[PDB]
Write a protein that binds this ligand. Sequence first.
Ligand SMILES: *[C@@H]1O[C@H](CO)[C@@H](O[C@@H]2O[C@H](CO)[C@@H](O[C@@H]3O[C@H](CO[C@H]4O[C@H](CO)[C@@H](O)[C@H](O)[C@@H]4O)[C@@H](O)[C@H](O[C@H]4O[C@H](CO[C@@H]5O[C@H](CO)[C@@H](O)[C@H](O)[C@@H]5O)[C@@H](O)[C@H](O)[C@@H]4O)[C@@H]3O)[C@H](O)[C@H]2NC(C)=O)[C@H](O)[C@H]1NC(C)=O
Ligand code: NAG
Ligand code: NAG
Ligand code: ZN
Length: 598
Amino acid sequence: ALVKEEIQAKEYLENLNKELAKRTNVETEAAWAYGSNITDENEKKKNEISAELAKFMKEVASDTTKFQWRSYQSEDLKRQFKALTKLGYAALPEDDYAELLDTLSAMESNFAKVKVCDYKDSTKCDLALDPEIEEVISKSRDHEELAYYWREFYDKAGTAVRSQFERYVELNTKAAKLNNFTSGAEAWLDEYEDDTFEQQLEDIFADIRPLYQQIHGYVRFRLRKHYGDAVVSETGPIPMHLLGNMWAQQWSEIADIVSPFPEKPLVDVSAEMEKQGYTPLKMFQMGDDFFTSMNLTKLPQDFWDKSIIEKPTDGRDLVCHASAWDFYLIDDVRIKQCTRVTQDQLFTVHHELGHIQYFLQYQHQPFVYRTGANPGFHEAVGDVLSLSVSTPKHLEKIGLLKDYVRDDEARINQLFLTALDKIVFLPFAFTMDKYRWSLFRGEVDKANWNCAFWKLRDEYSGIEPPVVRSEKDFDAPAKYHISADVEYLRYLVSFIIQFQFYKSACIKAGQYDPDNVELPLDNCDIYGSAAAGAAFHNMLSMGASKPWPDALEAFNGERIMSGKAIAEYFEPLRVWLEAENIKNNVHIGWTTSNKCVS
Ligand SMILES: *[C@@H]1O[C@H](CO)[C@@H](O[C@@H]2O[C@H](CO)[C@@H](O[C@@H]3O[C@H](CO[C@H]4O[C@H](CO)[C@@H](O)[C@H](O)[C@@H]4O)[C@@H](O)[C@H](O[C@H]4O[C@H](CO[C@@H]5O[C@H](CO)[C@@H](O)[C@H](O)[C@@H]5O)[C@@H](O)[C@H](O)[C@@H]4O)[C@@H]3O)[C@H](O)[C@H]2NC(C)=O)[C@H](O)[C@H]1NC(C)=O
Ligand SMILES: *[C@@H]1O[C@H](CO)[C@@H](O)[C@H](O)[C@H]1NC(C)=O
Ligand SMILES: *[C@@H]1O[C@H](CO)[C@@H](O)[C@H](O)[C@H]1NC(C)=O
Ligand SMILES: [Zn+2]
């Protein structure tokens, strides 16, 4: 019975893979329509399609129980069946499932329709996060203006959806239990296929905390000289609204005021991008070039015909948060980005294009294997290229960085600017899932949900709100991914493993030798390296066909997620920075925040 049944099973899967691909295509199309044009109508359609696919997924789960799949010889077949048993939200009773979609939709659409009044003109009330409020948080050095925009934004994107958030936690939890995980924490963590994963990340975070604390301390020092001691204390958490970003996840936008050597060059090519007439189209074409230059795959025509790479001008509602989309056919991949001509946006274009490349690289695989080896792998791909693009080396080659001397002081400036984006983010990213895990697991009482957020943010990042908050506010959904039910640990894993890929890609490209001051890891450009491209191909082409350790091994021979590489990259900075903090008697650490009242 069992040798025969295994042969039938292979044909069952082959055939079922194709059907899921096609049914997902339709669901994706409806999601796309909504996300690119928010209306009551498109909401209904997206939600009804999803409901129907959920119903089919349930029959598929049920059909898995008819096959003796755990007894089969083929690891590969067992892997595909295992994946089909994991329903996620689709396990919910029909009505509960529809209620959950309506709750998610309410939250995501609240986020995307937020608008605030101009600080200087309360008649003018149509400022959106993207682009208006983002530009003020990133450019203004008026602490009171900054604080105003912070409060207006968090009040509308966060507090306004407490009731919905709460319902979502209930449903998320119910759904996980139906799949027999303890909570949604364990449902998310199952993607990493490793029991010790949480512990591994705590270990890695603990090894990098000291460097993070040195950075924190230095930035605080510099902010005090800018804003004065009335605005920033020596010993407390940094007021977050001064850190150049609405969530303080990255601080690179205040590099003008905290850079180690302000006499020396600090790389910001936005102004040159605008002077040379760059458009979004050019930016995407440069990204394409980067990948084709490494002998990877060209964007297909469908990409250019159907992508949305600039913010519509018909004043409609849409989700402007940048995203990459697989449509599960052949060569139908798309990006929706409300692209602006800046350095940071050029990196985002590479980031998103990294997802697109992953899609194209694994599109021959069976449907259940057409995703990342783990979610962090997907988010890392494009960032490995962004690491290169951001190098002075690369930016001189493309004519965006003019008259740059690469002295020791400019290296330090560049290193620190990178650290503001890459080290700073790690605690931030860890907290976004720690908060949510703690609610999913039932560890925090509803009475304390807002202060448990800011508590994590204090303990891990050493920041706090500009104003006093309380349990009358609900601040966590003011972050896109929280409002939209996007797991965030992927981004923590990405910011660690991308240094492992980059370092390895740099070695393959000839651009990095430890024992050679002409090839330092932080000036490595892998543009043009078919040797780097080959490693990418070997790993990305695998999809989720094997456990992620085997995908990493395809790239570089390793099997372990490790913080060695990111430390190696920042080692030069750490040595200078420790010494500079001691030279200036810089206070390190912070007192417990007093900005969330229970
Ligand atoms: C999450 O964990 C849940 C437990 O916390 C789990 O729920 C259980 O799922 C079981 C599915 O295996 C289910 O098992 C069956 O139960 C039938 C009787 O149960 C009733 O009585 C209970 C009290 O006694 C009530 O509380 C329930 O509500 C039920 O109404 C059994 O009659 C049934 O049996 C048939 O199935 C087996 C088939 O199993 C195998 O397959 C082949 C052949 O098909 C065999 O050769 C093989 O060795 C093995 O037999 C047959 O052996 C048998 O002859 C019958 O045809 C079966 O045992 C159980 O009821 C349910 N329990 C509870 C408490 O809910 C969820 O499944 C988990 N969810 C996920 C997503 O994994
Ligand atoms: C947005 O979608 C609506 C349907 O709710 C449609 O009629 C409208 O014209 C759309 N706008 C664009 C530009 O797609
Ligand atoms: C480029 O990729 C192809 C597969 O598309 C491979 O066969 C070949 O070896 C690579 N070429 C170069 C320039 O190494
Ligand atoms: Zn991404």
